[PDB]
Design a protein around this ligand. Structure first.
Ligand code: HEM
Length: 389
């Protein structure tokens, strides 16, 4: 059995309902892995640090797909440490930072006004989900918003899931590190301004300029692809459930709970969350050997009908929506869940408040699904909307 199963994000792959909780798969890099897909066993793996994320990038171990970050930088990740580093990052991704909610509300409103000026149809990825995600990451890093197009150009290659090394990935990595290194010298605000303040002070002698830049580049990359991927596929969910989208547009007070259910039902994760077994361990009816690759499948857990009865139904009032695994779990639980949810709430409210009776402008089977990539994503998402308010 080959993994992944399909790049089509219109509905849960048929294969998910056919998997045993743990099954042997062949990865894109050609290695063997244990695919874990029940809620109980996804929870088990994610909450047990003997399943190691850090060790999945060790030289020689079985791989899901090729590294896209240069191996010498990957190998130096464990040395990027400091009370002030963790502090700087936690502060930058806090959605309560003064001005940030106001900035996101204005920028979302402006992007939606440009779609309305253009008229239907528009590609809501290129006119909204992408620029709204890219600009917010420029805002929290403290760099100019004109960086968004330069840095974003790397991302369709940087998050590829390739069987082989990707030459473009190194060229783009070096170009992005150079840009972020330059910003350490001229940036006074946000994550980069904070990192510049630590550089050449006590406790930070062990952090190179390259290592400071690495924090900027990887946080920009991770944040932008997670938020732009989620928001595109949250719109795909809403555009395949038009009567629910119409209901949410009329009941904006629902938006906090709606985002939890959109996260639970979301199909943007195109791979598995990798972990390396650091000991012999039992996982349900399977015996995992030390050094074996485990692939956690969030969509398996999230559509497990023993936890989420009627899992294919989009139900904004679903009581346990917030128990999903779309932000992972355990030690590596997304640190930016507060910001990802607030960003989605603001973006989706701006779209639904201004574009009445929002509809797919093409038959759902005429969407073009990105292949060979960490996220399921439609290449374009053409939409139309009715008149008036
Ligand atoms: C809806 C938006 C987002 C989604 C769905 C999402 C999802 C995830 C998931 C599933 C993980 C776990 C990966 C694993 O266990 O292997 C993760 C980790 C992480 N996310 Fe998020 N994320 C979102 C937004 C963001 C944002 C905005 C940032 C940063 C600005 C970010 C930064 C990170 C980082 C740095 C990690 C790694 C944490 C670690 O290794 O301990 N995420 N995210």
């Amino acid at each position: 059995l080959d993994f992944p199963f399909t790049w089509d994000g219109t509905h849960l792959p048929a294969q998910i309902g056919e998997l045993a909780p743990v099954v042997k798969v062949r990865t894109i890099a050609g290695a063997e892995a244990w695919l874990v897909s029940s809620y109980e066993l996804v929870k088990q793996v994610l909450e047990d640090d003997r399943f190691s994320l850090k060790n999945t990038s060790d030289p020689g171990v079985p791989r899901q797909y090729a590294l896209t970050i240069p191996p010498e930088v990957v190998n130096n990740m464990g040395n990027i440490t400091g009370a002030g580093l963790r502090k700087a990052v936690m502060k930058a991704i806090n959605p309560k930072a003064p001005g940030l909610q106001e900035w996101m509300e204005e920028h979302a409103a402006e992007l939606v006004e440009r779609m309305l000026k253009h008229g239907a149809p528009v590609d809501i990825r290129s006119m909204f989900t992408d620029p709204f995600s890219e600009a917010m990451h420029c805002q929290i890093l403290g760099i100019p918003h004109e960086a968004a197009p330069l840095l974003s150009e790397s991302l369709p290659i940087a998050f590829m899931n390739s069987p082989r090394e990707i030459p473009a990935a190194r060229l783009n990595w070096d170009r992005d590190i150079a840009y972020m290194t330059a910003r350490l010298d001229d940036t006074e605000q946000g994550l980069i301004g904070d990192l510049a303040k630590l550089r050449g002070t006590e406790g930070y002698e062990h952090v190179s300029d390259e290592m400071f830049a690495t924090v900027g580049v990887t946080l920009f990359g991770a944040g932008v692809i997670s938020t732009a991927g989620f928001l595109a596929m949250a719109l795909v969910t809403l555009l395949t459930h038009p009567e629910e989208a119409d209901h949410l547009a009329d009941h904006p007070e629902l938006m906090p709970q709606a985002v939890d259910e959109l996260l639970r039902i979301n199909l943007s994760i195109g791979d598995g969350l990798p972990r390396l077994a650091m000991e012999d361990m039992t996982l349900g009816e399977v015996e995992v050997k030390k050094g074996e690759l485990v692939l956690v499948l969030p969509e398996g857990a999230n559509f497990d009908p023993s936890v989420f009865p009627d899992p294919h139904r989009l139900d904004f009032t679903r009581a346990n929506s917030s128990a999903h695994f779309s932000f992972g779990g355990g030690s590596h639980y997304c640190p930016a869940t507060a910001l990802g949810k607030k960003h989605a709430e603001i973006g989706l409210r701006a779209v639904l408040a201004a574009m009445p009776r929002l509809r797919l402008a093409v038959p759902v089977e005429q969407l073009v699904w990105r292949t060979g990539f960490m996220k399921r994503l439609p290449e374009r998402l053409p939409v139309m909307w009715g008149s008036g308010l």
